[PDB]
């Protein structure tokens, strides 16, 4: 039972008996497992087709963009500083991979991260710039987040980090399943705190479906070169590919535009279907 | 005939003469924790028959204007006998369920109800300027549950929001079309065929055991697929009965007293 061909079709003749495959009861919740041979006459044919690439592994074997991170490299005195940028890791900033993942309730998988970096000038020539090097540091929850592009935190004694040189092939790393529970949960119908009757109101309030305050942490990105007289702007694009994935409890797909991290929906976008007629082909 | 059934749990028992069948969600029966999958090390508590018994909720009336009903578990049973006491005296808990919906009519009535059991049944709020902002009190109505609506009306009191849901019926309350909800465990009550539905729900979660006061594992939704009408306004009652199964509690503390209003 691995990439094997689907079952063959048999031959059937006329039927005259007290057996009624076509009559069933949808009320019971089960689906009638019929085949064409149970209702029409058929010829024998050898089957060759297989379901090898509708599987869960092949359905998630695509790298999908999830974020774009922007940093600058210019004299700090200018109106816009040498902007190191902070991004909190999530897949809900985009809709495609989010929609694909939310076909299910729980899942386990390893992740593959790919980074593509591009840069460009913003003013008319006025010289050039030497090749730039970027640092991408992972800041797990509880660690100190950088507050300046040249802080002590960038020593990365224990934090993982990647140094990337412009013009080279994209960077890539892998990470295991890092959940504190036995599987990730795409939905959580609950709260993180209970408001107690004997306690003041403000002390028990919480967001709906928040679960852990922040699951996985932060990515910090900067240019390592000091500065150039000319401003240079660069962007980093993050791509995700789940590996060795498992899933449970399928769900209906999203039918309307997303609105925030939750299942909420916005007014004026609740009419997905279009016009048709009952007796029109 | 195959339409007759009898079920007994503890000192409770049920008999039916016009049942379609019983559905077990995902074909799994409720069970206790195995030694190879138990995270906490303390000795659990199993009240057994003292809590594993059928409880009857308040009945509701089905008319032409009804849009639907929904409940949450274990929230709906928070005030039921010793089950609620064990829920509030302990930090951790888990259990399965047996849900039985009862609705009968004469041979001259018509209509249909769709009964769905959904794990992690998130619902959409009413605010259009904030997200995930509904309050605990409104999100847990108890044994009275809530109702679906046919239209979306966003709240506009930005300085004093109501902080409550607004589930549209055809979007199933969560942005997904109703017609696709049959992917969840379900059973249809068609008045011409059967007059009851029974569902067996095992414990489903990403954790072996969790807090019962903060998190709801299952949700129950009943919506009319075909409107009710009768020779002619028509009205018939729907009553709901639920029994915890294989319930287990851990982490005994002093009792919790949540703010319910």
């Amino acid at each position: 039972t691995s990439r094997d061909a689907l079952p063959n079709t048999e031959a059937s003749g006329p039927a005259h008996s007290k057996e009624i495959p076509a009559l069933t009861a949808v009320e019971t919740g089960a689906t009638n497992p019929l085949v064409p041979s149970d209702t029409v006459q058929t010829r024998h044919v050898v089957q060759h087709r297989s379901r090898s690439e509708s599987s869960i592994e092949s359905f998630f074997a695509r790298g999908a963009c999830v974020a774009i991170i922007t940093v600058d490299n210019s004299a700090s005195t200018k109106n816009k500083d040498k902007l190191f940028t902070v991004w909190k890791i999530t897949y809900k900033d985009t809709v495609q991979l989010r929609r694909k993942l939310e076909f299910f309730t729980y899942s386990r998988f390893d992740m593959e991260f790919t980074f593509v970096v591009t840069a460009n000038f913003t003013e008319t020539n006025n010289g050039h710039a030497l090749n730039q090097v970027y640092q991408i540091m992972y800041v797990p929850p509880g660690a100190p987040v950088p507050e300046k592009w040249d802080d002590y935190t960038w020593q990365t004694s224990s934090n993982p980090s990647i140094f990337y040189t412009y013009g080279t092939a994209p960077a890539r790393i892998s990470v295991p399943y890092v959940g504190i529970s036995n599987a990730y949960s795409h939905f959580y119908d609950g709260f993180s705190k209970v408001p107690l009757k004997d306690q003041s109101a403000a002390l028990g309030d919480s967001l709906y479906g928040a679960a852990s305050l922040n699951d996985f942490g932060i990515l910090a990105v900067r240019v390592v070169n000091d500065h150039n007289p000319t401003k240079v702007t660069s962007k980093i694009r993050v791509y995700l590919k789940p590996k060795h994935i498992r899933v449970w409890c399928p769900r209906p797909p999203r039918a309307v535009a997303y609105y925030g991290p939750g299942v909420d929906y916005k007014d004026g976008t609740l009419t997905p279907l279009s016009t048709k007629d009952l007796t029109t082909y | 005939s195959d339409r007759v059934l009898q079920l007994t749990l503890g000192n409770s028992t049920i008999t039916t003469q016009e049942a379609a069948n019983s559905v077990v969600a995902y074909g799994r029966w409720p069970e206790y924790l195995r030694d190879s999958e138990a995270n906490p090390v303390d000795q659990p508590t199993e009240p057994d028959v003292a809590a594993c018994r059928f409880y009857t909720l308040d009945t509701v009336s089905w008319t032409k204007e009804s849009r639907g009903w929904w409940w949450k578990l274990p929230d709906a049973l928070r005030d039921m006998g010793l089950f609620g006491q064990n829920m509030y005296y302990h930090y951790l808990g888990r259990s399965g369920y047996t849900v039985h919906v009862q609705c009968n009519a004469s041979k001259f009535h018509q209509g249909a109800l769709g009964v769905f059991a959904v794990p992690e049944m998130c619902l959409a709020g009413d605010s259009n300027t904030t997200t995930m902002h509904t309050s605990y009190q409104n999100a847990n109505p108890g044994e009275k549950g809530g109702t679906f609506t046919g239209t979306f009306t966003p709240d506009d009191n930005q300085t004093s929001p109501a902080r409550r849901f607004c589930p549209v019926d055809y979007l199933f309350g969560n942005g997904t079309l109703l017609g696709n909800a049959f992917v969840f465990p379900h059973q249809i009550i068609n008045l011409r065929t059967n007059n009851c539905a029974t569902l067996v729900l095992p414990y489903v979660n990403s954790l072996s055991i969790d807090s019962m006061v903060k998190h709801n594992n299952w949700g129950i939704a009943i919506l009319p697929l075909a409107p009710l009408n009768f020779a002619s306004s028509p009205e018939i009652p729907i009553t709901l009965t639920i029994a915890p199964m294989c319930c287990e509690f851990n982490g005994l503390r002093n009792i919790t007293l949540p703010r319910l209003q």
Partner: antibody, heavy 127, light 107 residues
Framework: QVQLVESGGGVVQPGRSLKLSCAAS????????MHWVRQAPGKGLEWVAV????????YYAESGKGRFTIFRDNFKSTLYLQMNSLRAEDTAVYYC????????????????????WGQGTLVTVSS | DIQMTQSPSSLSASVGDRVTITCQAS??????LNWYQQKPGKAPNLLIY???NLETGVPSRFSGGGSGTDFTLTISSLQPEDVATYHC?????????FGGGTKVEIK
């Protein structure tokens, strides 16, 4: 340099209500906590309230507690302050400021250092 | 709550002088204090944080010190454009609070 612009200030009769707004630009609004600080004419600074970038958790100083309300709209990148029962002692210039608490909803991991300030809007309680 | 007391309320000095300003706390707050500068008709500007760290872009003639209940801001050599009001601000715990402010003027 980010941009913070306040508006809504003006003359208000005693005992009435007023609403202030602060529009933010040049940065990701929904990842920072925002503050209100006021300065009476010729006096020192005075802190009012904070909100921890989620729209739900907040804190008020004892001067305006009970009367003032702070809320935000992350989709429009705007901050609001609703004032009720205004007294003659509430006359001051109101500033909206941004601290370094980025992904934080608790005092434990916040740190209140104000990097940016707005131009300020004047509120006068007189008749 | 914590009360911040600043002294002197105002002072005068000649260009090139060494000026010192003190902010005092009603209880020990480790090193949770900031300093701000506010020129007439403008919003405050951050000078020091953590009671010793100099904000980027600030002239090196500003420096902060102290710990516990006593803190100090000093200007090594006063310049014409330093005339402004100076505030101290603590963040030991909520609610936050500022000092009374100190005016600096040329003699």
């Amino acid at each position: 340099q980010v941009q913070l612009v306040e508006s809504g200030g003006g003359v208000v009769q005693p005992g009435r209500s007023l609403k202030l707004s602060c529009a933010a630009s040049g940065f990701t609004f929904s990842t920072y906590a925002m503050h209100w600080v006021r300065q009476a004419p010729g006096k020192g600074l005075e802190w009012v309230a904070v909100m921890w970038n989620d729209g739900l958790n907040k804190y008020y100083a004892e001067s305006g507690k009970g009367r003032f309300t702070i809320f935000r709209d992350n989709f429009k990148s705007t901050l609001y302050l609703q004032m009720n029962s205004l007294r003659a002692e509430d006359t001051a210039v109101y500033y909206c400021a941004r601290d370094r608490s980025r992904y934080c909803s608790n005092i434990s991991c916040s740190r209140f250092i104000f990097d940016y300030w707005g131009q300020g809007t004047l509120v006068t309680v007189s008749s | 709550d914590i009360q911040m007391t600043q002294s002197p309320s105002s002072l005068s000095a000649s260009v090139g002088d060494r000026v010192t300003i003190t902010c005092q706390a009603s209880q020990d707050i480790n090193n949770y204090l900031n300093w701000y500068q506010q020129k007439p008709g403008k919003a405050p500007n951050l000078l020091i944080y953590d009671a010793s760290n100099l904000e980027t872009g600030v002239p090196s003639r500003f420096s902060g010190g102290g710990s516990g209940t006593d803190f100090t801001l000093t200007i090594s050599s006063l310049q014409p454009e330093d005339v402004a009001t100076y505030h101290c601000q603590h963040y030991d715990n909520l609610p936050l609070s500022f000092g009374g402010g100190t005016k600096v003027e040329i003699k």
